Symmetry: C2
Subunit: 341 residues, 2 copies
């Protein structure tokens, strides 16, 4: 399969991240893509290509315009206000609050933010557009008839909802790709989020869309970021009822239990009638991944890929989470390999 | 007027405050109570006494039990979790999120938090409790017949809502005082929040209660903390319909304008028929406040006090905001002076 990757991801290099009550160097760092790209290259998938330029039409079909407009200038406004640090939200529209949008930059960032553990820094916007571009190109390859393709996206995007950034995500790539596929002739598309964390952004974007089915395998939100979405009972709403399938799982879940979930989701997706599947690939489910509590081993990522591919429909793998350890590349490369069959 | 002050306020001495993307020394620090207490004693208000011991019965009538339970052990669980910095929420139940409560510390701290600019530190709970004692005691004084009293509360509490902390607040001292007055025999009590910021926590606690009226004057939320509550449109709900009155004002607002809103707020308080008024006093409205944009002069506080006292009903002044310059002590004493007549 072809690999779409943009060097512009490096433009996203924030120096701080709120964690454990401290500002530390962001976990979703640049070296992540370097290794992923290297591990997959040696896996035989060395047909890497840069993405082409794209407008904002596709993304404007899945994200709020005010939200996008906010991102493009957030940093400039932030620095203009005179802040010495990076842009980090402090106040949030939580329970029983007004729906109005603040005019001030300090209020807007909070309004368009679901988690303070992510900071907007110089380049973030341009970086996000490029990662989005990789997703669009990957989607185009599926639309052209390619059986599979991998968009090495960075920054990731499954936590970016309709009008909010966080969880290290700004533009929901997986969602723009799903939208792209539709725009190219698909009537029904499915998104499968295997990343450790619930793809709360993706869920929100398609909760009321009946043309897209969302399935996510993640850690019980009762005790894992994002904490406020991902419960089994969230099955959709209104025009999108029945189109969301969450599979929350407790600590120590092994592939035995995890794989059963994968099986069930694939069933619901098949019953949904998806013409293709956008795979939100996050390899943070690895037993040796710092911020995660599932017990998956590297071999399992080969099973994961093969299994999803066995669906018989075209697949577009989109990069999401997975950090720290040097096995990230290997694990990602194994999912691609399993997909290759 | 009697002055209630506890030394255990010093127990609250956080080391960090997320401001402008950096963790800086908290604005609401111990040096505040020291200055205020010294200024009021120097203005004659030297009959200072420590609060008596009080249970949780009163506070449990304005705050959620779950929330209170959370605060008491928040710091213990945070350190026991392994985090290095202070307890700061990173994830927030924002738009379209589940109403479910997380089980881990990371999830609960966000669930019960409306702003990340406030961290839970060791001793915070005990401090918050003493501060609450000072309000209760001050309340009993009003119930005993005193026409005025001053509860030098710290930490402050007007930003603490039913089940969430923030804005340097954890327990809504003013709210507890109001409840106290009603438990002592009152049937209709009003709370006047002159603090620069909106009393989002207070408004939230009595929003659906008809026995309490809430009037607040504050920097327009469209561009001032907390940003998500305080618009004129917010007048109450259900059983509390019509019992909330917000008076938001723009940048550089001088007393010549601020005072006009005070006269109207007082007028609505009279129409409400309040038997007494708990005045949430924040002096951050001062023209020199490091984080507010109002242009009130030290002398105005004397006018403010005299005007509020002219209400004719008993007044309980509960300390809230006011930062930076030492004039905070002067400004606070000028209100007690204007109230004392
Ligand atoms: K997931
Ligand atoms: K106020
Ligand atoms: Na949907
Ligand atoms: Na009320
Ligand atoms: Zn993840
Ligand atoms: Zn204040």
């Amino acid at each position: 399969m072809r690999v779409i990757f943009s060097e512009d991801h490096k433009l996203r290099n924030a120096k701080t991240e709120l964690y454990g009550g401290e500002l530390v160097p962001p976990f979703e760092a640049p070296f992540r893509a370097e290794w992923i790209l290297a591990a997959v290259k040696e896996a035989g998938f060395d047909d890497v290509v840069a993405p082409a330029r794209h407008g904002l039409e596709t993304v404007l079909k899945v994200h709020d315009a005010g939200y996008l407009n906010f991102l493009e200038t957030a940093w400039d406004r932030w620095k203009a206000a005179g802040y010495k640090g990076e842009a980090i939200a402090t106040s949030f529209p939580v329970r029983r609050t007004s729906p109005r949008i603040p005019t001030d930059i300090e209020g807007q960032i909070g309004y368009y933010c679901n988690a303070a553990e992510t900071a907007i820094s110089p380049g973030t916007w341009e970086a996000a557009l490029s990662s989005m571009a990789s997703a669009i190109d990957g989607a185009d390859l599926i639309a052209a008839g390619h059986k599979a393709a991998f968009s090495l996206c960075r920054p990731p995007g499954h936590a970016a909802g309709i009008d909010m950034f966080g969880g290290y995500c700004f533009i929901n790539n997986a969602a723009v790709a799903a939208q792209r596929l539709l725009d190219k002739g698909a009537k029904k598309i499915a998104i499968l989020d295997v990343d450790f964390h619930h793809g709360n952004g993706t869920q929100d974007i398609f909760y009321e869309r009946g043309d897209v089915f969302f399935a996510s395998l993640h850690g019980d939100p009762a005790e894992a970021f994002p904490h406020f979405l991902g419960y089994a009972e969230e099955t959709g709403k209104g025009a999108g009822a029945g189109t969301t399938a969450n599979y929350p799982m407790g600590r120590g879940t092994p592939y035995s239990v995890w794989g059963e979930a994968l099986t069930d989701s694939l069933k619901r997706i098949a019953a949904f009638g998806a013409e293709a599947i956008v795979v939100s690939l996050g390899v943070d489910t690895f037993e040796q991944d710092p911020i995660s509590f599932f017990k998956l081993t590297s071999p399992d990522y080969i099973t994961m890929g093969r299994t999803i591919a066995a669906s018989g429909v075209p697949l577009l793998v989109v990069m999401e989470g997975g950090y720290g350890v040097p096995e990230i590349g290997l694990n990602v490369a194994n999912v691609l390999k399993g997909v290759a069959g």
